[PDB]
C-alpha cells in the first residue's frame with residue numbers, strides 16, 4: 761500500500777556502466793494499480 | 803453504539819456488500835455499485 765520512487769540523473773540505447781539509484785519519495789496512498797502512461801511537453 | 807447508530811423507524815444509511823466475484827485482498831476497499839452477475843445473462847445495469 762505504498763508507492764516508492766527511486767531516481768537518478770546523469771549526463772550522456774542505454775549506456776554501459778553502473779549507477780545505483782537513491783530513494784526520493786514514499787507516498788502512503790495504497791491504490792490498486794493496473795496500468796500506467798506517460799506525458800510529454802509537445 | 804446502539805444509542806447512536808439505531809432509530810425507531812430504522813437506520814438505512816449503513817450498507818454492506820453481500821455478493822462479489824472474488825474475495826477481497828487484505829487492506830482493500832471496494833465502492834463499486836455494479837450489479838452482480840449471478841447468471842450468464844448480463845444485468846444491463848438494472849436489477850432483475
Ligand SMILES: *[C@@H]1O[C@H](CO)[C@@H](O)[C@H](O)[C@H]1NC(C)=O
Nearest residue numbers: 792793794824826827830831
Ligand atoms: C485491481 O484491478 C484489476 C483490474 O481488473 C483487478 O483485476 C484486480 O483484481 C484488482 N485488485 C484489487 C486488489 O482490487
